[PDB]
Amino acid sequence: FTKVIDEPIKSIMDGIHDGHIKKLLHQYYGDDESKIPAVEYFGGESPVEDSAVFKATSSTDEESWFKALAGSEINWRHASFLCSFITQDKMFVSNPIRKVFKPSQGMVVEISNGNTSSKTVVTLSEPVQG
Amino acid sequence: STRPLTLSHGSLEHVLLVPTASFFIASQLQEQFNKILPEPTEGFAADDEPTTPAELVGKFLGYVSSLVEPSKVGQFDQVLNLCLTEFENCYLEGNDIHALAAKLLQENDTTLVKTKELIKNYITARIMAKRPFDKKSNSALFRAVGEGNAQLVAIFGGQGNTDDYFEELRDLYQTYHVLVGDLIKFSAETLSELIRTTLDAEKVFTQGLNILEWLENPSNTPDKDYLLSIPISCPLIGVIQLAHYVVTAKLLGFTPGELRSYLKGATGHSQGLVTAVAIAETDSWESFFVSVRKAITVLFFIGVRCYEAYPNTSLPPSILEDSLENNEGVPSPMLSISNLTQEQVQDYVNKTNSHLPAGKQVEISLVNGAKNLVVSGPPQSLYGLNLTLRKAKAPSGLDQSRIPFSERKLKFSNRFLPVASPFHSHLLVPASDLINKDLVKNNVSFNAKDIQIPVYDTFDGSDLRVLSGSISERIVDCIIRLPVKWETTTQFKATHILDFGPGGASGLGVLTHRNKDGTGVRVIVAGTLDINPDDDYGFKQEIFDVTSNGLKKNPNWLEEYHPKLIKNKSGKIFVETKFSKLIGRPPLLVPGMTPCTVSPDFVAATTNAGYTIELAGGGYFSAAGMTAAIDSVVSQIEKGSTFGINLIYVNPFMLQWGIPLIKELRSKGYPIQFLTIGAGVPSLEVASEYIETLGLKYLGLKPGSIDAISQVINIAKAHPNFPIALQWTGGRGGGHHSFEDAHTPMLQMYSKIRRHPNIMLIFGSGFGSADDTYPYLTGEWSTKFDYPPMPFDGFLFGSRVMIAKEVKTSPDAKKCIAACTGVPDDKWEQTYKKPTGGIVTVRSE
Ligand SMILES: Cc1cc2nc3c(=O)[nH]c(=O)nc-3n(C[C@H](O)[C@H](O)[C@H](O)COP(=O)(O)O)c2cc1C
């Protein structure tokens, strides 16, 4: 398959990806790009309600807690509570939204307009001077 | 009003709220039970001694039920009725007895025998308290079959599964006395009648067929070599099978006909087929005994006339000694051969049949798999074949890793089955005529209209309902002379299979499971109660469970690892695999290559195209040199772009600066997404170090062989939440390469790999185009080898990218690469001798 000299690496790899996409469209999506499901962003998936309220305790499981805070829809809240990394210029530091909302006794997260990404507001509240 | 009654045994204890109106009676028993109950030891490891509270309350139900008698109403009835109702409310949370039994085995330090004792006690208690199993259980499986989410097929085994088949009948008679007791006694009077009715029966039954006496007193039971003889083993294996069917019906509150109507179809390996036609005629508990009489009678005459046609003669002591001191079995009339093809075996039997006359020839009798056959014939003849085989096989502890795949001497196993007749052979043909006469003299005919479900013929896989001729005559023919093509008869489309047959985990169930792995079929072993640590097949408990543990499905690889398309908001379409889903970009990678990916210009340029690429540590000799390459990669890639790093495991010098550097650079947050470890797989303690310390998203491993894949699977099991990228490459790959085929190792290892949801499974060696990779993406590649589809999660492209514009490879080297014609997969191994397609193999330092 090594025949054409000086083919750009983008063109070889895209050639292979776009090859598969054309065969997978033909076989499993009757040649129709409209049948392809859409997400906001594709990635960061581990291989393993409008107005809600979540009271954390000492027993509250981290993973369950962030899955609830994140919501079902793929959008900025999903990223915010499930991305393990964010970027600072070119560096990849720990996600500070998952550090701040890390569950513990007293914390109370209220989600408002959960079903509309553009207007959702997550509001963490803790006991401050009683 | 009510008074607490403390019944105990050392540390374990249970409180029972007995009403005061019948308290004096419950205390009478409490004392009497405390006498028979032995002294409490440490860990309760001794026999006839409870190990959990549940066992103790069991024992108490067993003791109370022994004094009670069901004919007349006693004083103790009102205590049994209550103490039982306390067992139900405390320990059986709606579930059936078997589901508790199972739960006590895996959690607590209970032995199998104690659990069997606990089930007996509960079942006896239930029956003798005048509370029969009348109501239909809420078993998840039989719920799902009513709805249409499950399709049940029943299979019945036969001969050559265990030597100690009688222990299964002894276990049924003990543990389920009250359920099967009536069946087993009827089968014993039916056999005793057939012996005195038939002319020369008693001549074949030298030590009688008083099975009742053998079940009561284990001392009066004849030796195994008499029980194994087909005139006994035929009808008794039928009885065992019908007893498991009854139990299964009676604990589900179904009539036979009801349980038969839940089955899409039945079928049976060898004499199992007689049982399979027997259950398919059943309707009610009243007319169950005419369908049993027919089955037992057929198997009785098959077992007698086949034994009269070919009795087992004394084998020369020279042959018995040669077989034992060559790690083979005792020569019998059936020789299993594992891990050879049917053509390869039919070769060796055609060599061995040329030298032998007509009446001593061997034939292939059972085709249980692609690579799992059984040859029938005279035992001396099969010892012949076995001498012709032991010179052709490699020792089982030979190292063939350094030998190219096609030159490797084929290794296999060959044991003799524990069976005393050559079923499915020309030797038994003379018996056929005699059997067809004994079936019309005893009025035993199977009629096509009375058979309510399809029963699959073991030869061609056809239904026996659509037969023009006699069904009995065909079933006999299928057992005595026609071969069994098991894969051809199990072409039915079912989700669940119930193995009723004898042998449990060694039986027909587990074999059917190996044949059908990855097609989304779950086998349940309906006879044996036990635990499977793998959980690939289920046991008796799974039939009766009412929770979500009753309907467990097996992974269908084509549906579960189907490649999909997806698009993001910007409308860029991606191929969605387990791998691409993680890395958020197309499931193609440029693996680490010295010197192709040592260039920070080519790593940036591929990372910027939007593809994973490993920077090759092979081109670097210090942390300082690598650090300055990484800094150059970062400089050229966009914000949020990442890349990997390839380290060589057989360069310890390069790991002892590389691993600390990766750890340091990730602590400052450099965009190193993953580490790949080339040339061998790290040990568990080293792999655990890399996973937990290095701050990586996933870890690439590049297993050479089967043992290396098993070592990757062990690393994955240790860190079940951490993604492992198992980059499988055949030896046909560029650079340092193994001796292994690309396909054969994945066909063996793909199921074990897919048990572990954190292994992303990449395929390399010999790819350049969408055209050649697509079959690996959709899993059709494995349908050429007669396996179920095995889709892959991603691809790696080494050789293919060496002539890209951005690669530093000199112009005249690129011309020299592009001029190589290459060769197809089947030729590649020729590189070990001579220049094949412009490419050759040489040895490193
Ligand atoms: C030129 C070249 C250099 C390689 N260098 C390395 C290396 O440094 N480390 C490693 O694990 N594999 C290395 N490999 C093997 C590849 O990572 C991969 O196993 C192989 O390229 C895939 O086979 P293919 O070349 O037929 O596409 C190299 C392969 C080639 C062709």
Helices and strands in order:
This is part of a larger assembly, with 2 copies of chain A.
Chain A: H1 9-28, E1 52-55, H2 62-70, H3 76-82, E2 85-88, E3 91-94, H4 96-100, E4 108-112, E5 121-125
Antiparallel strand pairs in A: 1-4, 2-3, 4-5
Helix pairs in contact in A: 2-3
PDB class: cytosolic protein
Keywords: Fatty acid synthase, acyl carrier protein, FAS, ACP, cytosolic protein
Entry title: Asymmetric unit of the yeast fatty acid synthase in the non-rotated state with ACP at the ketosynthase domain (FASamn sample)
Structural commentary:
Chain A: [Alpha(6)beta(6)] hexamers of two multifunctional subunits (alpha and beta). This is part of a larger assembly, with 2 copies of chain A. Chain A has 130 residues and is of the alpha+beta class. The first copy, chain A, has a domain at 51-130: Arylsulfatase, C-terminal domain (2-Layer Sandwich), CATH 3.30.1120. The first copy, chain A, has 4 helices and 5 strands; from the N terminus they run αβααββαββ. Chain A has helices at residues 9-28, 62-70, 76-82, 96-100; strands at 52-55, 85-88, 91-94, 108-112, 121-125. In chain A, a hairpin with an 8-residue loop joins β4 (108-112) and β5. Chain A starts with 8 loop residues before the first helix and ends in a 5-residue tail after the last strand. Chains A and B meet through α1, β2 and β3 of A and β14, β15, α24, α25 and α31 of B. The complex binds flavin mononucleotide (FMN). Flavin mononucleotide binds at residues 591-594, 596, 616, 618, 646, 648, 678-679, 702, 729, 733-735, 764-767, 796-800 of chain B.
